[model samples]
Target: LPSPTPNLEIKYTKIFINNEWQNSESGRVFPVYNPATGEQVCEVQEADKADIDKAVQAARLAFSLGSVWRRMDASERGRLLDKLADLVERDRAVLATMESLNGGKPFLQAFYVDLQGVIKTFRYYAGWADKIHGMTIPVDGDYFTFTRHEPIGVCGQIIPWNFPLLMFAWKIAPALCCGNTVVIKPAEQTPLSALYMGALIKEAGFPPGVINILPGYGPTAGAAIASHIGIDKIAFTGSTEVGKLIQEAAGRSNLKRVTLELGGKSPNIIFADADLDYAVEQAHQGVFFNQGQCCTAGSRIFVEESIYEEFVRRSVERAKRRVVGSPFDPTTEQGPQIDKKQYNKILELIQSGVAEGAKLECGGKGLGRKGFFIEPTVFSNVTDDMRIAKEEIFGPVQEILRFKTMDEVIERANNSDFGLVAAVFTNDINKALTVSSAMQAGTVWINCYGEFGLREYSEVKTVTVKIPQKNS
Candidate 1:
């Protein structure tokens, strides 16, 4: 077992730009909090558009032609990432504690899952740094046509609060491995772990201005990054509404390349023939893990009418048994929601779920008045039109809706505007294949719901050279 985190300190609260920590241009600050106890953790500098401009300038300079970062060998860049991975590995415990302290995820989940995932994420991109290849094209003329991969310079990234450090690694590792300098805004709700990550990046020997960190509000900082012409690309992960706004801002400005991982009301369908115990557990975990703050959370579970009653009994018991407490508790499974806004929003949704005729099976109220912890709420007899079924709750509320047949479930599941991910549970390969194929999602899993590679951060350039003709 890992040692309990103690004597925790808040460090790196200032905005990070060009390998240096500084205050925002206006010296504005915002208070960060521990959601578990609603205590003020610390105050971090709040970056507005002016700070974003400065950070973008730093990233652009590092990405400029003939700069150290731009001119460095790809292999050497890989080695730098490898070194950073080593540092993160060494500081895994401390960083995990920071993650738990700031983001309100369980310590075990932060340490063993989130931190481990990030470490592996960095190493994954390290190997691909030099392996990114382009193709040689055979055109219909005497022209030597070949393509080369080029990093989109000066990428601006906006990450979410749920997985701040993890998303930081997700957005930065590949972007850096592909030779792009970046200015990243850690979501305002959670920025401590990402700020600490800047120190590791500097210590790993990245040149100044290669990676910049800004913690600021979305409308000011996030919108600026999306609309700024200096940024060549923007990557965002958050709500679908915010994703749409960022896309509009990106195209409205310089037609910047944008990639978004947005919201989901994903489905988890269980056939009658499936393993009942395993399905219940995985399906429960699919929604309850990370306190249900996942973009791909399978919140809208569609259990066949035959197993609906039994599954509901098991799920209610499980949610009742779940320990919702401090993130540092080794025995705890769920923690507090990020802040008051999310807490209220989740409670409101749960209230609406009850008002709209969804039966509250178990656990629907806050634990106490001290913190933002809400019970592991479960709902049965949930209809498709209920707010809990339609909206992305982004909290630890599970809604179970009934289904009669395959066709009924398929149409109901595919009715969402979101297509992030879907899950199916069954022993029949025929149904699995049919349902999975019919599911309108970016990715589908047949039997599992558990937890990207190279080329995500680069653009291909087709270079065609006209063949020189010899004079007769």
Candidate 2:
């Protein structure tokens, strides 16, 4: 028989600073609720500006020259990360249960998919630790040139709530592998799993002051981290508006380096030459996966006009079949929205679609009474100017538009401010290649979808060493 489901009990709800768990400096605590049930799961300590400063100072000391974290062998750093990954795998069930219980994701998806991704990410960056190298260049006859790759020091990472644990791994792993210390601020809604990960970080024998996890609201702790002069870099993953604010704060304070993976209104294109059944199935999964909360969710679809009608009918049929209920249910495919604000926002946008004259194919209502759940909604006959087509809904909503030719669809797909990811489906290799090249996105998926955990994070640097020849 399969192992028993792990208990949903929560421990380690306090802020983690310098490898120790403690209450916030302000003694503020907040209730963390289960989105599926709309009930309080537990109360977690809330970090404020003072706590952020404490975490940043600890990270600064750890990253300073000749510090333990800075002086350790690169391979040893990799070994510690490897150990951490092992521990993560060992406690996979507990972490997954916390994620599902607090973040409202299906248990199976959290355990089998997102938790697996965290492990793979840590391992991948562990291998990259020793490989963070620079290059050499040959200059004039009397001179030799080489380079060195050095950590930027004291990175501030703010994660999103959608994929809480996975985002935690993504931000911290690469920064640690490169020898930089970090102050991480987990999203307020989903802090339990990240706090649990802190225990494993300490267990893995990581040096004190190397990693700090702060749980607090965005305006206070988040703003402090962004504007902290002690921090050398800021990496953020969230909405476009918040990203812009973070970027501005970085500039106004210390002019620290900033990297942001902001919001996306990505498009999915399906051609007449594509296999209709496979295309429809992939498109459905593309939008509805993760309750459509993904930044790179394929929220908009442009199909060849000839096949648009059939595609819409089949997609509606599939949407009607999707199960929406408790996240713990093994059969449930879609869960509740993250909170009431998000649920109301999605409903308002759906109403905008109706008022704007776009045809509602199916599912434009809420589900259940207690939790914040929205139906898997789809809109057909959508024009480019429709709010549902133009904005990032970040919910289980799909908008399908009709296009005539490759150039038309490519042009439409490229017409967006946010270019995180896009998808194209066509059996014809030439069509796929052409559309893939023309689409402006960080990543383009052809035929298949949902591959992540490898790209983004880490940077390349050049080094130069000089040798002077004796006077001839």
Candidate 3:
């Protein structure tokens, strides 16, 4: 299908500020490229410290003048987000195409995961708009007390390129629903969808300063967002290394409420008694979905000793069968990695695994003549300390490890810094219950893996919202 509007020229290539799109005072523009073709795509807003300051100023002003946002009727905010959802639907095809083109994602997968998940997230949070409430706490004295889930104020949000729009919606929709204004900065590599989504915000009838989207490198706009005193909360989705930098900046600036959904090198366990066919299919999807760009990708596979060989063989076979090519073609099941940086990272990890004496079963090198493509690869005989086993490669690569007992898998799987997500394949009720309780992750999928459903909304609770620690 051809684009309905033929090759429209895009001129607004600057940071969005105060409801208007404008350039940085520094006059810099970051060059974006189509990852699939390696051609210049467009110039995005090259935001700097000054532009970030402008966005924070606008967000602070909006949040401070409670009337600007806080005073808006609760239902009205829900209506606005619903309108945004509607706008997303109206431009669904265009947004999906832009994501597929700029982010090097398969077109159909982008539509299914990025666009559809974004809509569901917004609507889900939208329903909670008017439902936000303060609880009544009974005290002994005459003073009547209640706890309110008030907005944290101006939030600094930095999301990953893997699922740009969906991650944005995850952080922003919740913050906005809580009455907080935001200065959002999406990743530089794949910012087209966020830029295009900004127009939809205006169409959604949001007030001028509610959300400001700045597409720039992390050091400039990201640093500004993290360190800005005006920001009340900081939410970021990226690597643990960068998460530390953001935390340090936030602490040095003013100790803002920081939220991090960081990287993972998670383990997925499959027991011998499980449904073998279903387990194999899900294992393939778990590791290869999104080209393994997901933070929660089950990159480590631990199968029962009885089934380890067969499982690895089946998983590798399935990975090889995936269609890889230009993302624009709907028939393609996989596409290039996000960029050269990530492409090289995947290759380096694979090389490291080989040096560590891991056996490469299938698909070890780059895939196509053009594009930043890596063959969906599998590594076996990996040690616990192997770079590929320990690190978050963020690519279509898997490390196979074997485990016999439930206790063994539990110990090995939980032996990492990341606590993002995990999956288990088992039929025994006692095993499922035991493993689900013992897994050290925010989410655990039993008898299945990587398929998103509405029920996950409840299980995907934030770990940081627990009872506050008493001061030292």
Candidate 4:
């Protein structure tokens, strides 16, 4: 029997520019599909370069010193964000449903996990709005001087599709709190929830043109946002290839401040002396969470040789038990790929793994009568040179390899081009500390996985102030 389609009302489908929901300048719209059912959920206006220009102009206007957003008190800005957070909390279920409908994540996880993150992010930044401070420095010169920590003016943010609403919050909350106006481009594959969020922003009494949401493809609007001379900064979360393009665009144009959180092929290490059951469970969650679409997904697993066989046995059993079905299904633990392109991509990589002679433990193909679904795939005895081990598959495919010594495994992990995150499961304090220090990644989790904190979103600025002696 087929699961029933979710009844969701997508209130905002057009591009949000200057606080109004309007059609794109090109007057073109694209269909948004439910990945779980492979059905058209609705159509959203697609912003072209012209529309992107309009959004950038609006943000620039709002960021101007005379504008209300610039003149408004910092504490008042925080209050507005607090109001928006309240609105999101009030309509949490609807946002969650829209997220699931748009991105193929299970509805419960969307509601309980993503929505909660949105709320927490907004509230956290709300507090920081009033607290942002600059220092006055003492100097031995003739004139009095001080430094001002000011907003960077108009910002352009591009968010990924996997966690649509959460990424929306991640980009907007800090930018707005820092007193910068923004034109944000949501992933074309998942635009509904972000547009809905635009409605919430308007309802929260934000001044017009302070925040604009544009839904468009990468080549046009995304590129415009990346290279726009009017935009002062560009923050992007996407593939490494796209991230490089954005960085180049920044340099080719006005050299906008660029911050990118790109792709990763993270390694999760399991030691022989670790708690076998707990390590296996964490390893399972690390890879299979979000259908393995996470940037920090532990796609590569390196276990101490003595326990490698036992770990694979437990991992296979767990993968077999995971239910892959409709996102609307409460029993479903895994959902479909975001689109047919990703589905095909995952399949192609899996084929490469098989062709490269890695042992396929289980689940090497797609599933379902309709929609893009892949089974929870696993590979054992995978060599480092295999495509599955080297590349970011961005699917529920886990590659397990064996290592003899700590130094050897650490070297193996650091050999990858990506260094976003890694994990080590060992009860021995020395082993955990030593391996974590040796791993060349931004973050490392010891004995656990997927623990995120708030510090990742904020940036620091150093202000130099000079004071001079007057007529002594």
Of the candidates shown, which would achieve the greatest lDDT relative to the real structure?
A: 1
TM-score between model 2 and native: 0.96
Tell me the whole-model lDDT of each prediction, alpha carbons only: 0.88, 0.86, 0.79, 0.86
**Model 3: lowest-lDDT 10 consecutive positions:** 454-463
Clashing pairs in 2: 145-465, 146-463, 146-464, 146-465, 147-463, 147-464
lDDT of 3: 0.79
Error of 3 at 154 (Å): 0.7
Better of 1 and 2 by TM-score: 1
Query: TM-score, each model?
Result: 0.96, 0.96, 0.92, 0.94
Count the clashes in each prediction. Answer: 0, 6, 0, 4
lDDT of 1 by residue, 137-254 (tens): 8776667788999998998899999788889998899888899999998998899999999899999999999999999899988899999989998889988889999999988899
| Model 4 lDDT per residue over 385-434, tens place | 87777787898898899899988988888997755688999889899899
Candidate 3 residue pairs in clash (backbone atoms < 3 Å): none
Using TM-score as the measure, what is the rank order of every candidate, best first? 1, 2, 4, 3
Better model by TM-score: candidate 2 vs candidate 3: 2
Name the runs in model 2 displaced over 4 angstroms: 1-6, 450-472
Identify the runs in model 1 with alpha carbons over 4 angstroms from their true place. Answer: 450-453, 468-472
Candidate 1 or 2, higher lDDT?
A: 1
